[PDB]
Amino acid sequence: MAIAHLATEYVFSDFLGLRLELAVDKMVTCIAVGLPLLLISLAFAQEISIGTQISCFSPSSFSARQAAFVDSYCWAAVQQKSSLQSESGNLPLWLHKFFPYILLLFAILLYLPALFWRFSAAPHLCSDLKFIMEELDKVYNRAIKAYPIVEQYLKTKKNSSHLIMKYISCRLVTFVVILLACIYLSYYFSLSSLSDEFLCSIKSGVLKNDSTIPDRFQCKLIAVGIFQLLSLINLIVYALLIPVVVYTFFIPFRQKTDILKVYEILPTFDVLHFKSEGYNDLSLYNLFLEENISELKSYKCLKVLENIKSPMLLLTNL
Amino acid sequence: MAIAHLATEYVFSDFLGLRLELAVDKMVTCIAVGLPLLLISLAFAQEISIGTQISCFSPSSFSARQAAFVDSYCWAAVQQKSSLQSESGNLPLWLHKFFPYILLLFAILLYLPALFWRFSAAPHLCSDLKFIMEELDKVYNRAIKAYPIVEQYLKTKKNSSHLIMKYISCRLVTFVVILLACIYLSYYFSLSSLSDEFLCSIKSGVLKNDSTIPDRFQCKLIAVGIFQLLSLINLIVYALLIPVVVYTFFIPFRQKTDILKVYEILPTFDVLHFKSEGYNDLSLYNLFLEENISELKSYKCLKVLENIKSPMLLLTNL
Amino acid sequence: MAIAHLATEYVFSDFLGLRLELAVDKMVTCIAVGLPLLLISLAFAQEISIGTQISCFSPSSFSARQAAFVDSYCWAAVQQKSSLQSESGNLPLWLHKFFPYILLLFAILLYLPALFWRFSAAPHLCSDLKFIMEELDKVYNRAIKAYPIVEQYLKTKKNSSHLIMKYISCRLVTFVVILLACIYLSYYFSLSSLSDEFLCSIKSGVLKNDSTIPDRFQCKLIAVGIFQLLSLINLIVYALLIPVVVYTFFIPFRQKTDILKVYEILPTFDVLHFKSEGYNDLSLYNLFLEENISELKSYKCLKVLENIKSPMLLLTNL
Amino acid sequence: MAIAHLATEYVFSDFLGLRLELAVDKMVTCIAVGLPLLLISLAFAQEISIGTQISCFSPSSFSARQAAFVDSYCWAAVQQKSSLQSESGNLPLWLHKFFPYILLLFAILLYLPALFWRFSAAPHLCSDLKFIMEELDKVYNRAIKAYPIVEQYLKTKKNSSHLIMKYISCRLVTFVVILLACIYLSYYFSLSSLSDEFLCSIKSGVLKNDSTIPDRFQCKLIAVGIFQLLSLINLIVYALLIPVVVYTFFIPFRQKTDILKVYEILPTFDVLHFKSEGYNDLSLYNLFLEENISELKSYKCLKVLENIKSPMLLLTNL
Amino acid sequence: MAIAHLATEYVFSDFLGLRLELAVDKMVTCIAVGLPLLLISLAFAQEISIGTQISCFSPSSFSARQAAFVDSYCWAAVQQKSSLQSESGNLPLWLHKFFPYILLLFAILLYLPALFWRFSAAPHLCSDLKFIMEELDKVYNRAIKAYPIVEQYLKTKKNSSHLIMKYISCRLVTFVVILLACIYLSYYFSLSSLSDEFLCSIKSGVLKNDSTIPDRFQCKLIAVGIFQLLSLINLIVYALLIPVVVYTFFIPFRQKTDILKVYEILPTFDVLHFKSEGYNDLSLYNLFLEENISELKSYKCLKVLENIKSPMLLLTNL
Amino acid sequence: MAIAHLATEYVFSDFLGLRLELAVDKMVTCIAVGLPLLLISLAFAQEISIGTQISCFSPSSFSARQAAFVDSYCWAAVQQKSSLQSESGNLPLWLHKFFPYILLLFAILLYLPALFWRFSAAPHLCSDLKFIMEELDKVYNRAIKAYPIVEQYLKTKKNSSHLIMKYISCRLVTFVVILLACIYLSYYFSLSSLSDEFLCSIKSGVLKNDSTIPDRFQCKLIAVGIFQLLSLINLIVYALLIPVVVYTFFIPFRQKTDILKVYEILPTFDVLHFKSEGYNDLSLYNLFLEENISELKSYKCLKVLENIKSPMLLLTNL
């Protein structure tokens, strides 16, 4: 059932009016959090899962309940380091049982920069964006009429580094969580499929005395096959996310258009050579402004006017 | 249960006021994404699925749990390349277990151009469309009263190629995902039905020592019959999608009406011979404008007036 | 559970302010799509389904799992043309397993003309209807005050055939999907009930060697009884739909009232003898207008005034 | 679970601002459709259903799966006229398996007059009601100020018979569906309880050869006991509905108050002796108006004024 | 699960702006309908129900399916008067299986006066209440300024008996449904617990020939214990409802305050000695008015003014 | 699943603009009703419940169905006073099976004072509160401008005792329901854990004759362990509720601030020494007013002004 419902919520909706997240970063966030949550739900859903994550071959002499005991005992035994006879150590077997939680942990860890960003930065930036947009409308309205406060404020943001460091840390945490997940997933996929099989014994002391119980059961972790397939898919996507997040650091290269220069044409505007090669809060505003200025009617008119110029009658014809 | 609910959400709703997607392209997208999601849910739903995707004939000497072990072991074994004795190699058997995920992967891959289009193009175009529509209302209002800014802007769009390349790439990605899916589905349907049957052994070393376990179990993947039927249906539809997407490229042929010529009749309008045989952003606007201009009251009046003409009193009679 | 919920959504709601579909055609569409969706859900719902669609008599010597293997193997075998010993060929047995999907396919196929109509025609017609209604209110307001634009536009629609052909094709596709479904359902109901029983063997080569497995199992497709009952019900309804859709073609006979003649009484209106015996877009508008004009206050007053006449003081008394 | 949810939706809500259905007829409709839907859901709900609708005594020598085969085979056999040894013919056994669908069929058949009435009459009448109400407010406003259009229109409705025949047919269809359901339910309740027991054999030819299978199984349709109880309840209610629907025909006797006479007191009103002993559209309006006039402030004042009279200062004191 | 959800909908919500039901009568209705619905859902919910309503001790020689046949056969047998060997007649055994429906029947029967009251009285009274309230605001506004229409209207209501008889019958039906339910519940609780045990035989003729089947099974209706507890709880509550409904008849004693006398203080009001010891529609209005007048700002001011008096400056100070 | 959903509805929401309940009393109510509902749902939820509330050790010679009969028979037997051999009498065993209903009964009993308070007091008080608040705004507005009606009204409330007795009874009922629940819970927790084990026999007369059935089964009520833990938790909380409700009676001590004295500073206000050591309706208003006056802008200004004073220019500076 779930799969199509999962597509509606997780894929066709922003399940996570200003643009307080950059569309690429928001998509990166939405993809990065969304992919493991979807894959987790897809692994267990009955469209794939035959049943229990684990099963063991009991002796045929066992009652069905005795076999059920072996399965359930060994499920606990998988983590219990004493219990097992793994050919590759206990830790890979833990990782299989842990694996659905481990995907979720990485998903939540990636959500933490998003939740941190929402509280730490979004309303603070929202206050600035609203102020800046309204000053540009005054500049536009005063242009239609035919002091340098907002640019001197943003000049101070070119000196400032406080808010950009909030973004820098937010990006860095996101990158590291992905990178460690990629190495973990790489190891988890590198773990030989044979690890899905392991030997178990219920022969704790009371059962240990019983000669009728076999010295080992042999058992297979059916999900592990599915998990390895899922892990490779997630590794591919996250491996693509790594260079994208690296690109996010290239902020002055990301400042593709100096929209300020479109206003600079106005006599109500100033010589804002604001290519912030200084990695400062202005640079972060400039990227956010590049998206958020697109909201502005004044910007649209001026960009159109700039593009054609590339005026008083035309401005009045507006 | 689900089937009628599935029809409401997936078929009778846009589960994915300006028209920021072309109706055909949106329908193509909605069909292309919707069909596999529906077919996936239909395969597993209890109205079709007898039960587990897999079952094996144990010996009758096996306890029910021993048989359950064989089924679950072999489900993992299907991917485990060492385990099996397939008559056609391991890979077709992987594809059966993978198949419900593989449909979903193609569905999500087709959603990526849609999600890319929403972020990369829709608000950017929306800004242009709103500007252009409002300029046409000025042209209309100034006609009622009885400079060439928007046409000179759109003239620059006839020089521009940036936004059209966003559409070109969006279309191309969609086409390639379909095409590879069609070849995959063709192979998957071409795979002989006998592949649904495969031989399995639980005889890893501990069980390998046990002489009482048979050297093979024989097993059948019951979903594979349903999947082959579903695959053919999806292949037929997507094979119909391939020429439609090809037609989407024929943009100047898709520019069926020069709505600009309806405004060209006005003295407040200009000689816009704007058959963009140059594949440029203007051409993309022209298609989107052809749909979006239908919103305009002014367009409706002028088209009516043009159709009758095919005026000052009439314009005042409006 | 579902049945009463199904009644609320599918029967007591439009699960599919202008009237952009004709009430009869919309009801025809809603009935035609709704009936199979309801019947599908009713077949499987536990209020009717005993359990699995299929069961086989194993030997009593079989373990319960061995019997479960026979059922599940034979479910796949039903489509597998090699497997069976059907008394009436493989194809009828496919149709039983396919049958719930086949009803849904016809339902979706009938939805395609509806979805096509929504995109291809509804907003285009909506633009015309709004224009025409507003012109009639001007005619009414100008009557209260005491040029032929809309009638000359609609005169051109009497020349035009583009939009009517969209309706013609929409109706024709709907008719053909029903007709083929009726012939399919007729065959499916004509298929002798004995087809519900079929012989199966699990004796692929590994099992073929085993002498203990019987040469055949005998099996019954329990849903097939329910499906035949459902098929007859659906056939009856759709057989009633066939003449209704035929009647939809009789468009000039469907033009029961020349509402234009009610306006023709006005000196602000013209000699619209618009019985469109020419099957042209005007005729399609006339039917849609016949429903949609009922919205108009002016129409209501004029129809009342016409009916009484069957005036200046009365018009002022309004 | 469902029962209390069922009460909220089906009993405490109108699950089906003008009063476009008569309250009695709407209640009759809501009761008539609601009762079978509720009873169907109550029959199957686990608060009553032990399990499967059917069970058979296998031999104790049968495996549990062999017994499950007998149950499922015989469920299909119940409709299969060849299969059985019924003491009262095949048809009563069909009726038991069919019975939950048959209740639903009658429910939907009764919904058809409601759905027909909604489309065929409700908006047409709504247009008339709004017109008539607004004319009465003019009569009231013109009374406060201190031509016979609406009464001459309604006089023509006294000549007309078109809309009343829509109601007549709507009532007649509803009556006949109930009546046939009552006779069916009477027969179904009259069917002796022993019919719940029937003999079955799986001895189609392959099984027919097997001597170990018994010549008959004996089987009981557990729901049939519940269904007979439910059928009697539904029969009682519908038997009460029959005289109510008959009363609905007595339209001039249903015209309990000539509300027009309350307006007739006004000098802005006329001698409307409109006891429509002629069964004409006016009569149908009069009943609908009797409910719908209750909306009117003017009516309330005039009825109050009439009741006290049973005035200019008082009218001004309003 | 359900229990806390049941509390939210049934207990913490009005699951059934004027006060068109008296708060006590509405609470009586809500309690009376709500209690059985809650108790029904509580009986079956898995927090109480072990499983099936019925079970029988088969012979240990029976297969599990043979035992399942005995349970299911005997469930039908409970109503089948021929089948059983009850120590107290068949009818008590019917009542156990019927009992969950019987509670619901009483619940719906009590809802009928509520649904009848909603349609038969609530909008009719609503029209009167709105009129009366607005006349009192005129009296208040005309007091601030410093004919007897509404009191002469209500004087006629003191002559009238039509609407009070609607209430009288509504109350009487509610009382009788409760009373018969109480006697039924009293009998059902009085029925000795041993009735939960009953003897059954599957020995209809085919099974009757089989000597291996026992002459009786012994069976216990596990719900009957729960039902007897529930029945006593419901009996206690409804026994408390009986005197409350009796009190509802004491309408002139229920007319605790002559709110009219608070207005009688005004010179814009009259000598309304309206203790309606005549059981007439005025009396019913007086109770409804007593609640509904509490809405009025004017009433609040006058009651405050009366209470202090117990004025022109004060009225102006308002 | 439920637990986190339960937290959202029951813990993070008011599942039960004036403040018509005191925040402490509302929290007391919400806690008191909420705790048992949550604990009930937590007991049965599969995160805790192994399965059925009851199980018995059958002989190993019993078929699984025979064992299922023993469990289900004994579940009924627990209440049936004849059946058992309890070491501590029948009544403790009833209490275990009854216990989930008994918690709910206490929860609903505590809801009754809340539902009584909502109907009996909340709208009556709401009328008073709105009046009093608006009079204080007149006093404030008349202060800004620079008769004793509301204080003389509230003086009469100091004479009155009618509404306070509604609160007194509401509090008293709540206290008694808690107290009896605490004694019941104390007994239920005091009941020795061994009571969870009890002996049962199915040897009613038909089974009594059978020598193969054991003279006793031994059985354990698995929920009883969970219930005892839950009972102690609920007892602790309710034991804390007892002194809180006692404190609610200390109304003049609860009148922590004479907000009236803040207005008394005004020349538009009077010497309201309204420490209602007379337990009268004024006292109840004073507590409700203490919360509800916090709404008032005027109060906030005056309290601020009082706190600073602890003025005409300042009042104008407002």
Side-chain angles (χ1 to χ4, degrees), chain F residues 26-41:
Chain F
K26 192 171 190 156
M27 281 295 102
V28 166
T29 305
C30 191
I31 289 164
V33 175
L35 179 65
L37 292 178
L38 181 55
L39 293 191
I40 290 158
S41 307

Side-chain angles (χ1 to χ4, degrees), chain E residues 292-308:
Chain E
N292 283 277
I293 295 166
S294 78
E295 292 292 332
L296 266 56
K297 297 179 182 179
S298 56
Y299 157 67
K300 295 161 196 176
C301 299
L302 294 166
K303 178 55 187 172
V304 167
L305 176 61
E306 176 280 313
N307 189 33
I308 294 162

Side-chain angles (χ1 to χ4, degrees), chain B residues 42 47 60 196 220 318, chain C residues 53 66 79-80 101 111 138:
Chain B
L42 284 165
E47 34 267 77
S60 61
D196 75 358
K220 201 158 189 164
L318 306 183
Chain C
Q53 288 81 342
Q66 285 164 295
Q79 56 200 115
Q80 286 140 18
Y101 294 160
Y111 199 80
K138 291 176 189 171

Side-chain angles (χ1 to χ4, degrees), chain C residues 1-8 11-14 19 23-24 26-27 31 38-39 41-52 54-64 67-68 71 193-194 196-197 199 216-222 224-226 228-230 233 294 297 300 303-305 307-308 310 313-315 317-318, chain D residues 2 5-6 9-10 15-16 33 37-38 40-41 44 46 51-54 61-66 68-77 79-80 82-83 97-98 100-101 104-105 107-108 111-112 115 118-119 123 127-128 130-131 134-135 138 142 147-150 152-153 156-157 202-208 210 212-213 217:
Chain C
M1 174 271 160
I3 291 188
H5 181 286
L6 295 172
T8 62
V11 187
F12 313 144
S13 312
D14 294 342
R19 305 105 175 290
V24 175
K26 192 171 190 156
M27 281 295 102
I31 289 164
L38 181 55
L39 293 191
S41 307
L42 284 165
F44 301 108
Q46 284 72 20
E47 34 267 77
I48 302 286
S49 182
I50 193 180
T52 54
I54 174 169
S55 293
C56 299
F57 185 94
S58 70
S60 60
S61 63
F62 279 27
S63 64
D71 292 338
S193 191
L194 301 180
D196 75 358
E197 287 173 14
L199 307 183
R216 296 295 181 287
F217 307 92
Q218 184 167 279
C219 305
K220 201 158 189 164
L221 299 179
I222 299 104
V224 175
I226 290 298
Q228 283 205 317
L229 176 62
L230 268 50
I233 289 178
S294 78
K297 297 179 182 179
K300 295 161 196 176
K303 178 55 187 172
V304 167
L305 176 61
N307 189 33
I308 294 162
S310 79
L313 177 60
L314 312 180
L315 291 167
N317 288 11
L318 306 183
Chain D
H5 181 286
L6 295 172
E9 190 82 330
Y10 307 109
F15 65 87
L16 298 176
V33 175
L37 292 178
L38 181 55
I40 290 158
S41 307
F44 301 108
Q46 284 72 20
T52 54
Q53 288 81 342
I54 174 169
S61 63
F62 279 27
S63 64
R65 206 72 176 177
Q66 285 164 295
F69 176 84
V70 174
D71 292 338
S72 55
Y73 181 110
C74 295
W75 192 229
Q79 56 200 115
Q80 286 140 18
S82 54
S83 319
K97 186 172 184 192
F98 303 2
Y101 294 160
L104 179 60
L105 173 61
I108 291 170
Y111 199 80
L112 291 181
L115 184 61
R118 173 184 172 213
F119 284 89
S127 79
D128 286 314
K130 285 181 174 180
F131 143 68
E134 290 164 23
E135 289 298 312
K138 291 176 189 171
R142 290 196 284 209
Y147 256 52
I149 289 164
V150 62
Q152 286 174 353
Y153 182 84
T156 309
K157 302 308 189 175
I202 71 189
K203 290 192 177 187
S204 299
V206 178
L207 302 185
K208 191 180 175 184
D210 187 349
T212 66
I213 296 172
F217 307 92

Side-chain angles (χ1 to χ4, degrees), chain F residues 50-63:
Chain F
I50 193 180
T52 54
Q53 288 81 342
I54 174 169
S55 293
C56 299
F57 185 94
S58 70
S60 60
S61 63
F62 279 27
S63 64

Side-chain angles (χ1 to χ4, degrees), chain D residues 212-315:
Chain D
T212 66
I213 296 172
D215 290 346
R216 296 295 181 287
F217 307 92
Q218 184 167 278
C219 305
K220 201 158 189 164
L221 299 179
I222 299 104
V224 175
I226 290 297
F227 296 161
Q228 283 205 317
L229 176 62
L230 268 50
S231 74
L232 185 65
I233 289 178
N234 204 125
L235 178 63
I236 286 167
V237 176
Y238 281 19
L240 300 177
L241 302 185
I242 284 172
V244 172
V245 176
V246 167
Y247 154 83
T248 70
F249 293 99
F250 288 72
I251 290 158
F253 307 88
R254 293 179 73 187
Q255 186 176 320
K256 289 185 179 183
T257 69
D258 295 335
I259 302 188
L260 327 93
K261 197 174 183 179
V262 188
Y263 285 80
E264 179 180 316
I265 294 168
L266 300 176
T268 51
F269 213 81
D270 196 13
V271 189
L272 280 72
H273 298 306
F274 284 12
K275 191 192 183 193
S276 195
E277 294 193 335
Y279 288 84
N280 288 97
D281 297 350
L282 173 65
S283 69
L284 177 62
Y285 293 117
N286 292 345
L287 270 54
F288 268 103
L289 284 169
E290 193 172 19
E291 165 143 29
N292 283 277
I293 295 166
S294 78
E295 292 292 332
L296 266 56
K297 297 179 182 179
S298 56
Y299 157 67
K300 295 161 196 176
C301 299
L302 294 166
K303 178 55 187 172
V304 167
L305 176 61
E306 176 280 313
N307 189 33
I308 294 162
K309 190 177 182 183
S310 79
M312 293 255 64
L313 177 60
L314 312 180
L315 291 167

